[PDB]
Symmetry: C5
Subunit: 346 residues, 5 copies
């Protein structure tokens, strides 16, 4: 009945000439390895380091005609992963690893099954900390495109070709949510074929389009910088001519808008360009700074020093205080319309 | 008397046809592996990473009829863990590992004992850093449910089935306490059977219901944000008409309630939704901000500028100061009743 | 003369029936393993993680009658630690490891010597990051008791028994000092025998009584919270009736005592109960807050508005200012006596 | 047809006298190993640690005449990296590793091809955390030069010589961008030959010239320290003679320029010398401090206490306030020209 | 000509009786191992952890008479480090490792050469994170002495003796600089021979005298705490009798000197004793606090309430303001002389 302890060593061992150092179809057509991944965990997307951690099931399917059995009755043999040191495997790697490891808890998390014609399925669990460049030109409203690319290191294009399969080449887990982002359904699958001075090597890559949850930044950044603009408008109502508190209220609201502007970039990389949260915290810094500059313009005109004109001399300091009480909720309201339309039109 | 150095190699070695790459009951019924865990250490439950560290004793019991002896007199053989590289073991893994390791101090912390009928006990010590999604909709008063699920990676459902045992499938250590949480006694034990394009794989999981200790947040968050509301009520008593200090006291209590609101989310993930500590630090931000807005309403009416009405002109600024001295401990007291009943009814 | 290259293989190898998978006195009395440790390094006692790092020399002594030689003349054989993969070793582990490793620099840091009757000394260097629960009810004046327990994993009580030796079972290095603590000389040595559903396993443990150096917390916490109480007493002297500065000095000393109360718990776990540094930073928060509340009581009575009683109307606002100038250094002084006697009586 | 399973063992194995412990041309001319690197990833350039992480492809070419075949028809043999434990390899290392590792995901990321005359190409993937000393004398405008040097450890100069190849010895990836720096195109390639008391060892090194993106520091450091200088010039306009706000505005702008000066060195090493961001934050600290010192000079002269001279007695306090209103935008403007010309001339 | 593939196995292998588990001169005089180190990298000297990272070349020279060849013509054999698993090596370790590792990039970074008489040179590259206790009684002006000690673990004094060699036992790299310290040229070389209950073990150690660069603490700690003392002297000039700003300037300069005193101990261990930066930040805290206490003494005497004495009643409040304007730059100047002479005399 061909006991299965003998059939493993009959097709892999010293007999039948199977050498694990030699690729299938040697000096012939190249090996066509097709791939698809299953993302278990996604996230911890850091921005100071500009990386993200993923946890994938890397499945590889190729054809090895030396492993094609004929006498065993069934169509597949799910095997022990101690056999995987004795068959040929493609030398796939990631061009943006930045450190990666296997999982070896209670057994090496590996899979091997061989069909009758020689089709070999090889599934391993890999934890990757993949590197992606962050384009933060409009920071709370951006759509990041972080990629992962699967190259060959030892075999060139005329020996080993990587492909995606047409039957859903990237599967995602059922309840995979992200704390700061969402993962869009459309995932690009293009080629990234590298040329070196050694040769040309195969490469396939999958783009992931991440869109931010803006609802966090409306709680910490935008609205608590919109309250302090209202504190700069409290100073336009008290006593209408001169007070020490109207400097002191314009003293204090600059302390926040300097600290909160520095506090808005506490967990960010040191990019050279200006971003969306900067030109909100800078324009709202002006409307705080122009509120103190307006009262300084009032006190400089009120403390200027007639027979009839002394009633008009207060009307030179009161007409300024009734334009600045009305026009600043028009200049702030025309910037607030100009800001969000510019960043919702992307 | 059958010396025990020979009996180990007789039942495991090249004789008797025992191959460690082949599961018990090959091409028959699937292997029924029953499991239970012992939690030594629990905790370091982070929230920026949304993970928790556990230290378990993973016990696995199955039946291997090829390991069934008959000539040895005693009922069990506690063995050396150097034997464990020569028997069949189930390829259990955790679907939410996020890195895990064995313990190999002074000996591999492993256990093996074999009964007469072939019952195999296999206990190992694993340190896990398990991932669980945090549902922080009501943050200091939530009941988190962090799980751990035990899957098979190479054998499908028709070859290997995981079960929990009915005799207390999750044991907890005697003095296992947590700094921030409590671990409830009722632990759910349900199934999580996964379907892939490779096959269907067995899965069992245990829910752990964690309940927060609210006593920490009453010391740092709630009561020091309740003192500053009383500082906003100090400004309703001094001089009753006009003072520079009543702006300056309303100046300073906004500096705290802006910093303490940002300080209340210093060790939290950046979730999009609003949580329980936000709508306490925001409503208590209003009662600070309305206290400055009330005095601005007094000074705008007091500095307005008759023959008889000038005594009533102070009564237009005194009646406001005696409603705001009484009605604000009524609006704060009706929110304080509405807040805690909403979050104790869960 | 029996050259020593042959005597190593004669007593350990395939001859003489020595099997390293079998414990001494098989199916007889249990193996009595006696232990003692030498602490090289102690410390890095974190409190957010509630752990401490130790660096021990773990010495183990047992009797192996199969290793008893008779023809070699000398009393001991200090051997190569490449031999330690060929003898029997007890499977000791620590029940609170939280990650631990050996030291393998320039040689495996191991020791082995075998007496003539078969006594085996086995000394290894281990770095442990041990877990101990912190009882922080009186935080700067507490006496912690952090333990370490040495269990067996595969052998039950009827096969292997751990003991401490009577000749100083815990040795400490000569100049071992700690930055925050002191290590007391009396060290408890009791039993911790564990019961599972697998069996009963041996356990011995050693308590370490750590006592804090209070001199750091007097420099940062206690005295800089005693200066700000004196700043709240500066406001009781200036102008005696009414000033904007007496609110503004009571404005500012609340900003410190709110920040310093939050700053006093910057490197602490989030325990639910109240500790000793809280009820010093809370009572000294009241004496700052009651100083501002006292001047608010003065200005509310001074700005109240006779023919003769107007001189007594200032004496209603001056008698309050001379009781609050004297009685507050009596209430603060009666708490300061009540505080330190409560926490020196432990 | 000479099947390739036999040709691997024929030229590497026990036959033909190939010993992997013996260098080519033994007791002859030294082995000339030529090298070139490909940089995949560059960056995470820390400054507290003074290091940088790189991810290179280290290609090594030498001549091994014992590997020179003649019967195989083709010009090269791309081999399995399991062969690399059986050939001679140069013992290259980096003199400033500070920890480094290989990449072993899905296969050891190694390359081996052997030409007909014995030319061996050996490409491996290394992640390095290389140490470079930071010269921070002018911090936001400096040009760093961080090196990497490739030494030999066991073979001296008379046995093994490292060289760079003339055909572009340092290749850079296509879209390699940096968040804070730019990598200049000209890369130095010089020698670093070391002399010890063991011998003289070969060394080659490549300088990398890094130039900072100044655009980040113009957003956080320079401009928010230029707004506070304008706040110190607001105090020169209000009431011209005496006000409590002109001290209080000079009170508050020192609080920022002390905190922002300490905040400007939050992610910097503790170097002894003075840098460019210090003498900008110190001179702008003076122009804040001299603004408070100017008003203190006004109030000391205005509160001095004639018959005719009392109108000139205000002109002694008004002429100071109209020179300090004009000359301080001349002293700040002459420093601002003197600062940037000094640091653009490098 | 004695081909070198045979000569390696002739003197190391099964022939000639060479056993790598037996030390040279067995049951004779002890093995005299002489040592010297080369320091490639030094630094990252942390103080919260109280450790430092070094990167050494550990060279060991002993005599092995079984390795003494006679037929080979040359004087030395630089060998492959794959041979090092077959010779005897001393079991040197460091008594204060705190974790350490080898360097294994592109080859194990090891060295072996054997002279004709049996002299063996053995150089390896080690990265150590060594522990040294910090004596911080005078913190910015201290001279630390951090050591490293090289013990034996398995062989006692009668079997193995460590020595330093007289020809410069500690070499330092050419351009080894430190960011915070300087390394003095005189390095002590003394003995540290340990006694245990196992036996007496050899030990040699080298002291390293580190001296701080004081230039950093003059930029952040000393001078920005000397400017705030000048802000406390601004309040002695304005209006000479009574002002709300003279409390408010003494209000604000306490906010800095409380935060900067806590900010000066942000990267320090929690030592119990008082250090040099504390008694500078405490005495300069008094001169800020006495400036507010002086003006409180002025306003208490000025607001006291004659016919002739009312001009002398201001002279009781003006003579205090002209002694405190002159004597405080005498008390601060006599402390500043007393402080630096005490800490330059060491
Ligand atoms: C792996 O996949 C590649 C690409 O799908 C296969 O290469 C292709 O092989 C076919 C026949 O084997 C080639 O067709 C031939 O084209 C030539 C002109 O070049 C002409 O004489 C005929 O029309 C003939 O059909 C095809 O060109 C070739 N394509 C490429 C890009 O190389 C390869 O055979 C597959 N290997 C295995 C083992 O499945
Ligand atoms: C491992 O556990 C599973 C589940 O308990 C066992 O499978 C069960 O095996 C029994 C008999 O071996 C099956 O009963 C049979 O049912 C068929 C109809 O399907 C009918 O002819 C009879 O009523 C007969 O009793 C049962 O259906 C089957 N259940 C499942 C879900 O497969 C299995 O035998 C156990 N294996 C070992 C080695 O203990
Ligand atoms: C390891 O240590 C244990 C405990 O010291 C030893 O067990 C003890 O062995 C003695 C004699 O071997 C026992 O004494 C006997 O007691 C029985 C009654 O139980 C009675 O017939 C006699 O009085 C006799 O002396 C003793 O009970 C037993 N104690 C325990 C707790 O088991 C053991 O022998 C030691 N093993 C080795 C290899 O040194
Ligand atoms: C590896 O490269 C080095 C450097 O290019 C080669 O060393 C050089 O070898 C040549 C001939 O083998 C030497 O030329 C000879 O010079 C002597 C005087 O020293 C004189 O008799 C002749 O003019 C003769 O041409 C050359 O000096 C020597 N240079 C050095 C620096 O050693 C070496 O041969 C190369 N090895 C291999 C295996 O390719
Ligand atoms: C390793 O070094 C040690 C110390 O340098 C050597 O030990 C010394 O060996 C010499 C002769 O081998 C001893 O001198 C003898 O002293 C005895 C009195 O003890 C006396 O009979 C003679 O004066 C004779 O010269 C010396 O005492 C001894 N010193 C110590 C501290 O043991 C050892 O020989 C060296 N081993 C090797 C293999 O080089």
């Amino acid at each position: 009945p061909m006991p299965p302890s003998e059939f493993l060593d009959k097709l892999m061992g010293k007999v039948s000439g199977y050498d694990a150092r030699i690729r299938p179809n040697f000096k012939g057509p190249p090996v066509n390895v097709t791939c698809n991944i299953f993302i278990n965990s996604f996230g911890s997307i850091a921005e100071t380091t500009m990386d993200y951690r993923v946890n994938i099931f890397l499945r590889q399917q190729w054809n090895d005609p030396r492993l094609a059995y004929s006498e065993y009755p069934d169509d597949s043999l799910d095997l022990d992963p101690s056999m995987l040191d004795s068959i040929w495997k493609p030398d796939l790697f990631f061009a943006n690893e930045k450190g990666a490891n296997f999982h070896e808890v209670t057994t090496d998390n590996k899979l091997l099954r061989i069909s009758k014609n020689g089709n070999v399925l090889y599934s391993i669990r890999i934890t990757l900390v993949l590197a992606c460049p962050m384009d933060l030109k409009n920071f709370p409203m951006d759509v990041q495109t972080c990629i992962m690319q699967l190259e060959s290191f030892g075999y060139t294009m005329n020996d080993l070709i990587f492909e995606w399969d047409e039957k859903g080449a990237v599967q995602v887990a059922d309840g995979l949510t992200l704390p700061q982002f969402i993962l869009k359904e459309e995932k690009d699958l293009r080629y990234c074929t590298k040329h070196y001075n050694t040769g040309k090597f195969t490469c396939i890559e999958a783009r992931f389009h991440l869109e931010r949850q803006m609802g966090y930044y409306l709680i910490q950044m935008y609205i608590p910088s919109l309250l302090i603009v209202i504190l700069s408008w409290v100073s336009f109502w008290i006593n209408m001519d001169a007070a020490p508190a109207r400097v002191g209220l314009g003293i204090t609201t600059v302390l926040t808008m300097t600290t909160q502007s520095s506090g808005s970039r506490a967990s960010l990389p040191k990019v050279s360009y200006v971003k969306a949260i900067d030109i909100w915290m800078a324009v709202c810094l002006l409307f705080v700074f122009s509120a103190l500059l307006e009262y300084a313009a009032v006190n400089f005109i009120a403390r200027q020093h007639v027979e009839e004109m002394r009633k008009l001399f207060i009307s030179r300091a009161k007409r300024i205080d009734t334009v600045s009480r009305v026009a600043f909720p028009l200049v702030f309201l025309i910037f607030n319309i100009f800001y969000w339309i510019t960043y919702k039109i992307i």
